[PDB]
Write a protein that binds this DNA or RNA. Structure first.
Length: 437
RNA sequence: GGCCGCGGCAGGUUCGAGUCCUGCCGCGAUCGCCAC
């Protein structure tokens, strides 16, 4: 009921249980056993090493430390060969430079090669920042681990946790910085309410000042923004969430939300009461990781949104969805039908040459002068939003993002009305329209 | 690998288009971002 007891109740939700903690130490003792077996210099980093890792989020990260006499050549190769002999099931994923994902005694493991460096300079790759982040926090985070998890869980419940493009929220490392800055979970929430889009937080300097952008200065890298990939709208949501919490704090703030799935009938009544045009672009999911797909579905939805906008259909909102098979680009427009004719602007009556040319073109209706310049009645190729997007997506598929636009080129369909409500987009359509209980 | 920001080239549209379409090359050796 009070603020005090809520935070402790919530702890249970964010804190790994002992057998989860246990899973991690065994896999840590074995890993550390295999490298001391193969005698490589290393360091453990990340949420696990700082004991800040979130419940059910367990991942062991291990950085392999190479002298600077080497290059990517010994890094890529002999960074892979070390992973194979230790990891049980090795899945090789990529980054700027490739690393080795996998498992050891049930626990997930990431093994990332890098340089043995002094000081936070000569830093090129972003995988190089990672161990220095740890050295910095390791000392300042000791004892505040639980405050960190509280912040993380609060965010992850509201869907803004993590910096991947699927989220564009607050990265874990950023959370750790905040608690080190504001001292605890609560004070962060207390303080976040007063943040602005121009807020600069210099962690290392104990300073908050006004910038050109919302900026968290990496203690390690004074030029880098730890908050770089946080979207404005997600910061706006966080500030909005912090205020709500302080006004009326409840445990609900730490509990993951319902999708709000609605029945297609009641949903049929809403769309008809709004009297809007609700339609969707359906196509097969490109086989690509989400951090490619999602940024593209964002772009695709934008290019088409701007189109309906440019085309005077008065779009309201756009969304998207990724199922296992299909991807959906969602739209709602104020305009279900527009007239066949419009007004193109002509040249000023004074302008001889350009007027002769404007008045020559074959048009079904006679042009006219209004406010000292010529206007003509013209004819659009499509009178409805669904028609224009068919037209637009078909010709312009290539600007819809590489991989998404390519699948849209090789197939796609426009859904609306009852067939639309049959698709597994019902939750998204609700958020888009802002449907209540 | 993709997104994003720029720079350049050739074509389209339009009465005209530095602002829109289109495709191409280049750029991120002071870090753009994401493999959370």
């Amino acid at each position: 009921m009070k603020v005090e007891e809520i935070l402790e109740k919530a702890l249970e939700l964010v804190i790994p249980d002992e057998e989860e903690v246990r899973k991690g130490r065994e896999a840590e003792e074995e890993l550390r056993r295999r490298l001391d077996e193969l005698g490589v210099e290393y360091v453990f980093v990340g949420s696990y090493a700082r004991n800040t890792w979130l419940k059910g989020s367990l991942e062991i990260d291990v950085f392999l430390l190479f002298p600077e006499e080497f290059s990517k050549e010994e890094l890529r190769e002999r960074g892979l060969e070390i992973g194979k002999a230790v990891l049980d099931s090795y899945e090789i994923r990529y980054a700027e430079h490739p690393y080795v994902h996998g498992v050891v005694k049930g626990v997930e493991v990431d093994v990332v090669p890098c340089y043995k460096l002094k000081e936070p300079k000569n830093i090129k790759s972003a995988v190089d920042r990672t161990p220095f982040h740890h050295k910095w926090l390791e000392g300042r985070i000791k004892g505040k681990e639980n405050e960190v998890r509280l912040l993380k869980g609060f965010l992850k419940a509201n869907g803004i946790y993590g910096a991947e493009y699927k989220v564009r929220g607050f990265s874990g490392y950023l959370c750790e910085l905040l608690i080190v800055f504001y001292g605890s979970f609560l004070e962060t929430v207390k303080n976040a309410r007063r943040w602005t889009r121009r807020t600069v937080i210099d962690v290392a300097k104990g300073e908050v000042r006004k910038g050109e952008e919302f900026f968290v200065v990496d203690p390690v890298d004074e030029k880098r923004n730890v908050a770089a990939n946080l979207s404005l709208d997600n910061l706006a949501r966080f500030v909005h969430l912090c205020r709500e919490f302080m006004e009326a704090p409840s445990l609900g703030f730490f509990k993951p939300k319902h999708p709000l799935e609605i029945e297609p009938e009641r949903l049929r009544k809403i769309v008809e009461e709004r009297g809007t045009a609700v339609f969707a672009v359906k196509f097969r999911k490109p086989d690509i990781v989400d951090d490619n797909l999602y940024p593209q579905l964002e772009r695709a939805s934008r290019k088409i949104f701007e189109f309906l906008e440019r085309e005077n259909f008065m779009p309201l909102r756009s969304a998207f969805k990724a199922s296992e098979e299909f991807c959906y680009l969602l739209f709602e427009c104020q305009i279900k039908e527009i007239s066949r004719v419009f007004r193109r602007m002509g040249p000023q009556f004074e302008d001889e040459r350009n007027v002769k040319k404007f008045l020559s073109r074959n048009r079904a209706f006679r042009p006219f002068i209004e406010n000292g310049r010529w206007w003509a009645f013209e004819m659009r190729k499509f009178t409805t939003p669904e028609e224009g997007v068919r037209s637009y997506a078909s010709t312009h598929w290539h600007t819809l993002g590489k991989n998404v636009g390519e699948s849209i080129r090789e197939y796609f369909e426009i859904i609306s009305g009852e067939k639309l409500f049959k698709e597994p987009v019902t939750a998204e359509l609700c958020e888009m329209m802002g449907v209540k209980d």
